[PDB]
Design a binder for this molecule. Sequence first.
Ligand SMILES: [Mg+2]
Ligand SMILES: [Mg+2]
Ligand SMILES: [Mg+2]
Ligand SMILES: [Mg+2]
Lengths: 277, 277, 277, 277
Amino acid sequence: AMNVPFWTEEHVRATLPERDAESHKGTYGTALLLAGSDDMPGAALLAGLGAMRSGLGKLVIGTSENVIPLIVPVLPEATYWRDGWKKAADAQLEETYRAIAIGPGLPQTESVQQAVDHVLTADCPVILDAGALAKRTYPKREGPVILTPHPGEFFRMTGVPVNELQKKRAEYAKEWAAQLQTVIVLKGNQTVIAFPDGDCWLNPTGNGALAKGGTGDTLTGMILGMLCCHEDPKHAVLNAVYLHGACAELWTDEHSAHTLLAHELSDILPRVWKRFE
Amino acid sequence: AMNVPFWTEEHVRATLPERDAESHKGTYGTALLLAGSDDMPGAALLAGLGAMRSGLGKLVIGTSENVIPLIVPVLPEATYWRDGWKKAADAQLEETYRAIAIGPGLPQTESVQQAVDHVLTADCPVILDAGALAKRTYPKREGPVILTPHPGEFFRMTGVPVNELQKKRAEYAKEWAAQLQTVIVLKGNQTVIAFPDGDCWLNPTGNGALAKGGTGDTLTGMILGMLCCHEDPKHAVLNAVYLHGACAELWTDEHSAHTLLAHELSDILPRVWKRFE
Amino acid sequence: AMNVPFWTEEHVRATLPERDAESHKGTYGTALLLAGSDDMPGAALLAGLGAMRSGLGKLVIGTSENVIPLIVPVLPEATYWRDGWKKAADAQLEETYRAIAIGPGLPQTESVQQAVDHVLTADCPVILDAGALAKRTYPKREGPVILTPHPGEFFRMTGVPVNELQKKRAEYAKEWAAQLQTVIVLKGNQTVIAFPDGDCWLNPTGNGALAKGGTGDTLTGMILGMLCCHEDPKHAVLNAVYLHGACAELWTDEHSAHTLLAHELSDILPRVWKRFE
Amino acid sequence: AMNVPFWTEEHVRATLPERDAESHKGTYGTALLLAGSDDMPGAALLAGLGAMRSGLGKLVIGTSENVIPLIVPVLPEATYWRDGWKKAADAQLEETYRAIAIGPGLPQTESVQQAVDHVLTADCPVILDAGALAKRTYPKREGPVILTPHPGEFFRMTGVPVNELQKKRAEYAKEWAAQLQTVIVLKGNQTVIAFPDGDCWLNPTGNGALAKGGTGDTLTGMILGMLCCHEDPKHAVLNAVYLHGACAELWTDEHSAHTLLAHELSDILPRVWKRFE
Ligand SMILES: [Mg+2]
Ligand SMILES: [Mg+2]
Ligand SMILES: [Mg+2]
Ligand SMILES: [Mg+2]
């Protein structure tokens, strides 16, 4: 209705970064992932895998102490900030991170919002997902704030009912990205990527294989990693959403759309990303 | 002897659901799996994997607290109800589920039957397996109750000795499905799927690769997921049994029937299901 | 020197069992594996995987309590006897098993020999490996006792020094199998399988990829499973040793012999066994 | 600038060892890996996998007690020295090892240096990495000491700033290998392998896929294993560095360089090593 353009293959190809011979892991930065609670532990593994697959140099996972042992055997490349999402409620971040994500597998509590307030004082891009998504405003800061709501979370954030939202997804996403001065990745078929400067795109990739628990956690991780290897954070977000969807399309070539598990998106990404190089 | 028809490839093809572009995980529902105990933990992983592979939107696993960490690294897409099968002995279910399964890896105790009585007060289809199978009757309710006994469990449920049962499997399955007003999936070579309205089918797929611990737990999970993505729960049961067997047949093309592990059925399902689309 | 015959492909093909359509897991029996200690936990996973891959119907692992959680995510098809190898020091076995193995990952202690004495009172074939191997004699019983020493363990058992043993491996293996009235699988290149009735064979398969920790634990498990699906326990032992070696040969077709991990033998077995059907 | 030669394919082919038919795991020795702490557990899994993949006979991992359970399900072939890196601060090594590595995932503390002093009293080659790298000297002993610093660790060791180091990498590596009488593997694009007798080579393999956390831990493990199967420890180091890089090059044939996880290098090595045989 607003003729929002698709972020196409051509755009992805033109903007994906090189990983040059003369680089070291510092070139690609350290990401912080604040995710996973004793009650919802898997989200940290999913987002962790997505992040480390997506071109960062190092990952620190600030998860609950009891979640750490669940990640290690699957993602032994990650390091930890023990009870980090909880500690961030109380402490300013001491360390410098290339990018931060908070919220997958975290409860919708006031302490999580305290952590969010502290995350927002760093200079880097920050992603808020899942339990970090609330009805609130955001402080003026340097780096972008990227919100990743599904339609129900968008309702929690705005009071726009899901049935109204779905009739005018790009119009609402654009309006609220402007009002909040945040990026909004409004999930669903034809995910909307709305920027606070008024740019907006639709994602052309993906299918119903994604309509299952965990695929959003994987996407948050993918955005986090891509923020570390792209110079332009806008391109990071757009490429992450695109490639995430593309992985589901590769899956359905030889596998039923009913049968995908989110972690497999991460396993598919290496070959899918190669195709766009 | 009763000329029970086979649920054939043609029937599977005609009844498997589409996963359309405009869907979200809510379309495909949340399943509850009440399974796995400290003493028999693996059943929860097997049934969990089968369920999430089989087209549901979300899975909540109500397992023993000490089992949770064993599932997470393999199935990070699942969420949990801590000690859920035990809590269900005491509590009415508060939440609405698309479908429920109870029993894999659970002991044959009175408290498990208390949990079963509570599960039966929800409106959705319910599967009872393994330790949830007992000599008992069932209350009139909306959704179907699906019992998944092997011949020894059928003896526990009915007093029909296994040696007599095996001479007349479909006749006994049909008779007892009618008497109990439950679906009965009577396992074995040529698994019988008997409905309480008198419909009955045989399953034409599978082989002796299935004759090993865990393959029934996988099947319970597969039924659970398929109940979430099929509109007709009868077709869900029949397709789950069929596809489960078909996975074992794909296995034996290049692998010895002596060497299958149940979890691999779940790993095979994505490609097998595609073939029937 | 004694012209001991090789157990050849032809012999394997003629003796491997069918897994027929009309079977159930009971047909193929329940095995008990008494293995794995807090100090040497991996042996239980390796032997467990080998056993469940090798045609049994059910596996009960009697391992240390703290080892159980390490097995479940890899082998969720196994069930447990908590602290079973320790409990067997004190208790007669109550249950009937198709076959039993004891010793992988267990210490060389008197309590382990107490467990061995109790295992030997069951009627089934029994395998003794690793910490269960000691200088001792064996009581007259029905089923065979199968000892699986490497040359150093054979020295512990007999006082034959390794340097003398290695000059006359089949002569010593045959002599001691007769003296002890046990089967002796004397490991190494050209593994000797010596029976107490005087039959003896050499194994023609395998290579130096096997010369690394864990491959013997895998073999013990393979013998355990094959004892469950072969009518003739002699053929079970001989086929297990043969197929174990054959898996290492398949590996080295496209992978360096320096790089095999024991668990991969179990992963290779499905395709290797198919070739001999 | 100093015309340092590359360690080429031809050199690798001429020096890689055979794994002969008549070998046993003792032929290839027992390695000790002192790695992994509660705070940095993954390094032990990465280095463990690299070591066991690289032609040793047995591996003992002296890791923190709470790390052990994280390794077992992935590497069940390893055995353990519980809290071994900590115990080595206090105890002379009692056992004889073919080679030792210390430091991946260990903190930069005085107690770790105490452990290093004890490790250095064994006769075998020893690798120091990560937290074991400090500004210090080394005692005259038989076997080589192999330091594996990245440029920041080289600064910690020498006071040569990273920006100066990077202009003259081979000159600084050679100078400091001579001064310390240690091997120095100075990591980065064109890794420098400097020997204390003045030999020095550059590594021609690898790419930016390696520029991510964990790949150095994998390399330490690879050196450790190769020290066990090569007669000449110089060739072990050079081949480990070469093959590690070659694995990343194989990866990038069909996968994006941004998406490699360190553990996959270990999974690739079997096929890559075969190519050089
Ligand atoms: Mg989400
Ligand atoms: Mg069952
Ligand atoms: Mg052994
Ligand atoms: Mg390092």
